Structures are given as structure tokens and as C-alpha cells.
Symmetry: C3
Subunit: 82 residues, 3 copies
């Protein structure tokens, strides 16, 4: 009977979420053309250094911490190693 709002900042219509084995939460912040992440316990998000994103629609993270993003408005899929 408890839900928790995560302390992300300045999201605009977030489109997708993933979480890695360390508990870091990754979010496609669609309306801001960026991907943000928040480590478990952390109070401050960091912005992943993707470039040229256009309304990213979704995100996945693998066992190696590689982050995959559907860059919807650019008809492509990008990834970034940890």
C-alpha cells in the first residue's frame, strides 16, 4: 500500500524505464530529448551523454550496463556502454 515517487528532476512526458542489476533506474525523458538515470539511493539524476536524440520512446539495459534507446524521431536505435 506504499508507492514511491523517485527524485528525478524536470521530466517531460517520460516514455520508458529500465533498471540495471545495481538498481540504477534509466528513463527516456521524451519531451526533453534526453535519457536520465538515478543510481539506487541517489538523490540526483545524471544525464546520459547521448546526442541528437529526438523524442526517445524507450530504453533497455543489459547485464553489462549497456544502455539501448529507441530514438523514435530519428528512426534509429542507439546504445551507450557503461
Amino acid at each position: 500500500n506504499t508507492q514511491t515517487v523517485l527524485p528525478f528532476t524536470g521530466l517531460n512526458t517520460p516514455s520508458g524505464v529500465a533498471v540495471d542489476s545495481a538498481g540504477t533506474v534509466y528513463v527516456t525523458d521524451r519531451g526533453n530529448n534526453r535519457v536520465v538515470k538515478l543510481a539506487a539511493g541517489s538523490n540526483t539524476q545524471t544525464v546520459l551523454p547521448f546526442t541528437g536524440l529526438n523524442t526517445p520512446s524507450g530504453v533497455a539495459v543489459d547485464s553489462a550496463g549497456t544502455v539501448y534507446v529507441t530514438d523514435r524521431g530519428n528512426n534509429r536505435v542507439v546504445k551507450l556502454a557503461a
Copy 2:
């Protein structure tokens, strides 16, 4: 090449899906402002006790069974313990 339609009911423009190590299937039922799940070997939907969602867009689950949802219409990310 036979696909199977899962026995979810009453969905309205479902927006996202996650499956965990136990084979439980979680779905953001966007048009009904809710998240639903179906365990493996189960036929019956349960609605997750999130509250105040608005057109949720995506869902993720960690190894501990914690469910994370991008609550798109409210510009926030919410989580629920197992």
C-alpha cells in the same frame, strides 16, 4: 510461427511491457491509467496498487520484484515494492 494472445482483459491502448526472471508479465494499460500483471501459468489479471497514474507509458522490474512505472501524464516515475 504461432503467436499467442495472452488472457489480459479490458486493455485500452497498452503502452509497454516487462517480464521478470519468474516469467510474470507486467503491462502499462495506458488508456485505463493502470498497470496490470499476469503470472506465468496464470489466466487471471491482477491490477497493481499504484494510484493517481495518468497515461503510464512504460514499466520495468528489478531482481527484487520492485515495479517501476513512467507516469507519463504526471511527469514522474513511481515504484512499488513486491
Copy 3:
């Protein structure tokens, strides 16, 4: 910290992404009403034999390689075995 563009071809407004334990990447190619997959280390995708999708919105893959898709326009969730 530099992104890589994955060698998918012909995508149209992709909506979601999943990655399995082998590093195979699965994408809901929303604008083409299909789901594509790219084997690890491959530059040539295949199309999964789902049927009658309409605006697929998200994808997940379990430990057994079963692929689950939210078929937004048909208010259903479908799955295909590996």
C-alpha cells in the same frame, strides 16, 4: 562517452527495445507494424513472425527467449516462443 547507432534498417518511429541474455536486440518498429531483431554482432536484422500487429508499443524478452509485445492498436499482448 560516445553512442553507437545499431545497424537496423528501415525503421519507422520505433517505440520500444529489449535485450536478451545473449545480447540480441529486439525492437518494436511501430510505424511498420512489425518487430525486428538483431543478433549479437550482426549487421542484418530479421523480422519476427508476429501476425496482425497495429502500432506495437513495447517489447520484452524472458530468460527462455520468449518475446512479448504490446499490440497497442489491438488492445492485446502477444507472445512468440524463441
